[PDB]
Amino acid sequence: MTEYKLVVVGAGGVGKSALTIQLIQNHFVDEYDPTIEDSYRKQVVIDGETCLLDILDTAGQEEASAMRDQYMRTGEGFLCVFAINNTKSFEDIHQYREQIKRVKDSDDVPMVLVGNKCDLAARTVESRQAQDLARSYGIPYIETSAKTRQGVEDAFYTLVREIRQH
Amino acid sequence: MTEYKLVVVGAGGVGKSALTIQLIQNHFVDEYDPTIEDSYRKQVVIDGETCLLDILDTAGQEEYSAMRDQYMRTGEGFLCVFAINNTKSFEDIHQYREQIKRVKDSDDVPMVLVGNKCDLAARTVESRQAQDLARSYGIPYIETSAKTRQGVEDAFYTLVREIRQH
Amino acid sequence: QMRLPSADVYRFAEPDSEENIIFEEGIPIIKAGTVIKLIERLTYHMYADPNFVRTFLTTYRSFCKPQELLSLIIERFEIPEPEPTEADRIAIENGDQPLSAELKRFRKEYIQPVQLRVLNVCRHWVEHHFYDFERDAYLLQRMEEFIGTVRGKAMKKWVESITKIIQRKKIAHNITFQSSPPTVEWHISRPGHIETFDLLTLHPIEIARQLTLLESDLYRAVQPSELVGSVWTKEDKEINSPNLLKMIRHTTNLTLWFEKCIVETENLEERVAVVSRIIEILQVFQELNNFNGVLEVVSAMNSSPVYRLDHTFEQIPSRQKKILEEAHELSEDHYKKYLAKLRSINPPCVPFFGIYLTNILKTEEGNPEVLKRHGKELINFSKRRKVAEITGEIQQYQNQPYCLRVESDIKRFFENLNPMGNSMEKEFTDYLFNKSLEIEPRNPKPLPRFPKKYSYPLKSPGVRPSNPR
Ligand SMILES: Nc1nc2c(ncn2[C@@H]2O[C@H](COP(=O)(O)OP(=O)(O)NP(=O)(O)O)[C@@H](O)[C@H]2O)c(=O)[nH]1
Numbered sequence: 001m002t003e004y005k006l007v008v009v010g011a012g013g014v015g016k017s018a019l020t021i022q023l024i025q026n027h028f029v030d031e032y033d034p035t036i037e038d039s040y041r042k043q044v045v046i047d048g049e050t051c052l053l054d055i056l057d058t059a060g061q062e063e064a065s066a067m068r069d070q071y072m073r074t075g076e077g078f079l080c081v082f083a084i085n086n087t088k089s090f091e092d093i094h095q096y097r098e099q100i101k102r103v104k105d106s107d108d109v110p111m112v113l114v115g116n117k118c119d120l121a122a123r124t125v126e127s128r129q130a131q132d133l134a135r136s137y138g139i140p141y142i143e144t145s146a147k148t149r150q151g152v153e154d155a156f157y158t159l160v161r162e163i164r165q166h
Numbered sequence: 167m168t169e170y171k172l173v174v175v176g177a178g179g180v181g182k183s184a185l186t187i188q189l190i191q192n193h194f195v196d197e198y199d200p201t202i203e204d205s206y207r208k209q210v211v212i213d214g215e216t217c218l219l220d221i222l223d224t225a226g227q228e229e230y231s232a233m234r235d236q237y238m239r240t241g242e243g244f245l246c247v248f249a250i251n252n253t254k255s256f257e258d259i260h261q262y263r264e265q266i267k268r269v270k271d272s273d274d275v276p277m278v279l280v281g282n283k284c285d286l287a288a289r290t291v292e293s294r295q296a297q298d299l300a301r302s303y304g305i306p307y308i309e310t311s312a313k314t315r316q317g318v319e320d321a322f323y324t325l326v327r328e329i330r331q332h
Numbered sequence: 333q334m335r336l337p338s339a340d341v342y343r344f345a346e347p348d349s350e351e352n353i354i355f356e357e358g359i360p361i362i363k364a365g366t367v368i369k370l371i372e373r374l375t376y377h378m379y380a381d382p383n384f385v386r387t388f389l390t391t392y393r394s395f396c397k398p399q400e401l402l403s404l405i406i407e408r409f410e411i412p413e414p415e416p417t418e419a420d421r422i423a424i425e426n427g428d429q430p431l432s433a434e435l436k437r438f439r440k441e442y443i444q445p446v447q448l449r450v451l452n453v454c455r456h457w458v459e460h461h462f463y464d465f466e467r468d469a470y471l472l473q474r475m476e477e478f479i480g481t482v483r484g485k486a487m488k489k490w491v492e493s494i495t496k497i498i499q500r501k502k503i504a505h506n507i508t509f510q511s512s513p514p515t516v517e518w519h520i521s522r523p524g525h526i527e528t529f530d531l532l533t534l535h536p537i538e539i540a541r542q543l544t545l546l547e548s549d550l551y552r553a554v555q556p557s558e559l560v561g562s563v564w565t566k567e568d569k570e571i572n573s574p575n576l577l578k579m580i581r582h583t584t585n586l587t588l589w590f591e592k593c594i595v596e597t598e599n600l601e602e603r604v605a606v607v608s609r610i611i612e613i614l615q616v617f618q619e620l621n622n623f624n625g626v627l628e629v630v631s632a633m634n635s636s637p638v639y640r641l642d643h644t645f646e647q648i649p650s651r652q653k654k655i656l657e658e659a660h661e662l663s664e665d666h667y668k669k670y671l672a673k674l675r676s677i678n679p680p681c682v683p684f685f686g687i688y689l690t691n692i693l694k695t696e697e698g699n700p701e702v703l704k705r706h707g708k709e710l711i712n713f714s715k716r717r718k719v720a721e722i723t724g725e726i727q728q729y730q731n732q733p734y735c736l737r738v739e740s741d742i743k744r745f746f747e748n749l750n751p752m753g754n755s756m757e758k759e760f761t762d763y764l765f766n767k768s769l770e771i772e773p774r775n776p777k778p779l780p781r782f783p784k785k786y787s788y789p790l791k792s793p794g795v796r797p798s799n800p801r
């Protein structure tokens with residue numbers, strides 16, 4: 001089996017942890033406990049191949065921006081998350097993409113843009129704007145809901161496929 | 167060459183695992199990882215004859231009592247171990263031998279009685295008691311101290327000789 | 333570079349040496365070290381390693397007491413800030429504000445990451461190892477007081493969080509699925525008629541499913557504390573490893589029930605139907621990746637009373653003999669095929685716990701607790717990383733839940749199975765073997781005939797699910 005190191009980044013509160021735990025335990029976390037640094041392991045078969053996913057859940061709170069570079073060097077793929085009812089989180093995406101590009105010193109890093117919280121009806125970011133940004137980066141855009149599981153497997157597994165073909 | 171399948175049987179906590187480890191492992195290396203292949207095989211020379219020892223040791227699984235018959239049937243020789251500071255383990259020997267005879271469907275199965283010193287606690291089974299029990303069954307008695315590596319090779323080599331003379 | 337605090341005011345500033353830390357020969361991997369160095373690395377400012385926190389929190393009790401660990405991390409957390417540099421002093425001395433370039437860098441690249449990491453240890457400690465706090469009231473009071481003394485807005489988010497987590501642990505988990513669970517299947521016994529439940533009256537598909545739910549929950553309830561230190565093998569095992577023992581005892585009980593169902597069915601033709609049904613249950617276990625279930629059947633088929641029934645196995649159809657043989661091959665050569673199979677499936681699954689127990693036990697007694705270097709006695713951390721690697725594998729398979737509906741009555745039926753009755757092990761074991769001799773005497777004694785005991789059709793409904801609801 002092949003191992004893949006995925007990293008989930010994005011502004012605080014977008015649902016990086018909820019997406020991760022929904023994928024790992026099929027459970028939705030309603031509590032909001034700010035992450036410092038957490039890692040998860042998951043054995044799964046993707047496109048007929050068995051693989052071991054190592055998922056690093058990062059801190060969104062800017063009061064930990066110093067540790068960032070530390071996890072981007074080891075990561076092979078990145079899930080860049082923002083919430084569709086939070087314009088500032090969407091605007092923070094640009095910064096995460098640039099840090100990753102800088103650290104790993106590459107303009108071809110495997111990543112997926114994820115618009116989380118698609119179960120909520122108070123949308124402030126249109127699918128089209130996120131889609132345009134994704135195209136400008138040459139990556140796919142996947143909308144999800146850690147609450148309903150909608151699009152969750154798709155986001156993580158698409159990221160795995162990008163690392164595999166990269 | 168000839169491969170001998172040896173089974174270590176006895177109550178939990180009598181040091182079956184330490185005996186096997188002392189026989190197989192490399193004694194002059196800092197780290198031991200039983201999670202690696204061939205941690206049960208060992209090529210040795212006994213009375214000028216080169217052979218392969220395959221140790222079937224399931225220490226730590228004693229509570230799976232219904233799996234005993236299956237684990238024992240594959241062995242050619244048996245090490246019946248007890249702790250010299252544990253009278254209970256000594257008294258359990260009788261039934262282990264009966265179970266071995268039943269699974270091998272034979273009244274003459276190659277086996278050795280092993281008294282192991284696990285620690286500094288007080289000895290409760292004297293050598294004479296063990297030698298009398300061993301004599302009553304028609305088998306060799308060997309005392310060991312896995313911790314200090316005394317008598318370990320002797321226990322297994324004596325069993326191999328018992329198998330060869332069968 | 334960046335000047336660290338004086339080693340005279342902060343113990344975690346002593347430089348690394350062959351006397352206090354050893355690395356393995358791409359973050360550094362610790363082979364051994366003093367407790368002080370282990371804690372420094374546990375909360376290092378340069379790189380991350382969430383793998384280290386779990387390993388440490390899971391195994392530290394053998395080389396460090398809880399109270400002492402708390403003292404050391406609080407001491408680690410209290411980092412003294414550096415004195416103003418020459419440039420700062422010159423500014424202060426002229427009545428203006430210092431740029432404090434170095435102080436700000438030190439807070440950003442050393443203090444913050446170290447303090448956050450200390451807090452991370454505290455959160456995980458309380459979150460997943462609360463028993464330390466349950467067993468020591470003062471330990472909890474000290475943690476609550478430590479967390480409550482932390483000042484500064486740069487920590488308030490995490491302080492508030494941990495305080496709430498601690499209170500939730502003192503007061504006292506829904507599951508969402510992709511698809512919907514399959515419909516419960518019934519055979520001869522109908523819903524609500526628990527009195528007719530038995531091996532051949534319940535649907536084989538539902539027997540395998542309900543037992544898999546049962547066995548999955550037992551597996552998922554085993555905590556690392558029940559494994560570390562090889563406590564399941566010691567005199568206090570019933571106290572220290574209750575969930576592990578419940579799981580093993582269930583497996584044993586089910587294996588004996590299969591053995592009993594077979595040898596107590598004296599009529600050859602009916603016994604063949606019983607063996608056949610059990611192999612079909614095995615087939616469903618394999619489809620569900622319930623390896624524990626698969627092995628309970630294999631152990632039963634390989635027990636002394638059953639293994640010797642040649643006349644019975646002669647009538648089992650060839651396709652089923654192959655199924656049983658493939659299952660048996662998983663355990664051969666020290667479970668080589670099983671290990672390969674487990675690493676290749678798509679969970680959910682229910683692993684065989686036996687393998688893990690043997691590997692933990694050997695790792696624990698095949699490695700020294702400390703490594704000596706220049707007279708110095710260092711904590712052998714590699715031994716701990718190995719035990720934690722195993723407990724980590726176990727946990728990885730404990731995450732995925734099964735998408736199957738529980739059937740209260742069938743579950744109850746299997747929870748109350750008691751094949752041994754009030755009889756002791758030896759007596760029951762001998763009873764089964766004597767029954768085996770009765771139904772299929774040793775040669776040259778002739779095979780006798782026995783009357784049928786079942787009043788309902790013995791035809792199996794098969795193991796292919798039906799799709800109506
Ligand atoms: N309705 C809804 N709420 C969600 C969703 N994902 C997360 N939330 C909620 O949003 C809050 C924050 O989620 P969380 O996973 O902690 O966010 P995070 O990005 O990990 N935060 P941090 O960076 O601080 O660690 C929680 O109350 C959570 O239940 C979603 O898809 N739908």
Ligand SMILES: [Mg+2]
Pocket residue numbers: 016017018033034035057058059
């Ligand atoms: Mg989080």
